[PDB]
């Protein structure tokens, strides 16, 4: 029986329209963890303008294992955008658990097309803020 710990983190990126124009910008959340108290620290990482040429039309979104003194940790994850009413939308999940090590991320290079994000009718940048919600399910050996 795998032993699984569920935790989550909400991140608001303020002043989204002030992200850098040149490609390559990385923005990261504060670190977060489960209560399991095992020295693991995670964060979210966003490339507002894509990771590379093929993905330049998208925002990329990754889960990063920032600190981990053990060889490896397996975890499932899910990311959602919170809309102008506070509800989850446009979520995508990893489906299976991915193997993290310290400094490794897993996520979605093409999380959402930027033109959809920047279309006010979709209500995803209210007050120039992008709010993302990450749910993680980590396997505890």
């Amino acid at each position: 029986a795998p032993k699984v710990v569920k935790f989550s983190y909400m991140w608001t990126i303020n002043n989204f329209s002030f992200c850098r124009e040149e490609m390559g910008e990385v923005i990261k959340s504060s670190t977060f963890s489960s209560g399991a108290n095992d020295k693991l620290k995670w964060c979210l990482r966003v490339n507002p303008k894509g990771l590379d040429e093929e993905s330049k039309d998208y925002l990329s979104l990754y889960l990063l294992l920032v600190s981990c003194p053990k060889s490896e940790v397996r975890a499932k994850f899910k990311f959602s955008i919170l809309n102008a009413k506070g509800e989850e939308t446009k979520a995508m999940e990893s489906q299976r658990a991915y193997r993290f090590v310290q400094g490794k991320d897993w996520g979605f290079k093409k999380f959402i097309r930027r033109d959809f994000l920047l279309d006010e009718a979709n209500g995803l940048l209210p007050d120039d803020k992008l709010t993302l919600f990450c749910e993680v399910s980590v396997v505890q050996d």
Binding site: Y98, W106, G107, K110, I112
Partner: peptide, 11 residues
């Protein structure tokens, strides 16, 4: 182009 691509990768 797809609005979202559910392919998981590592940066």
């Amino acid at each position: 182009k797809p609005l979202q691509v559910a392919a998981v990768d590592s940066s």
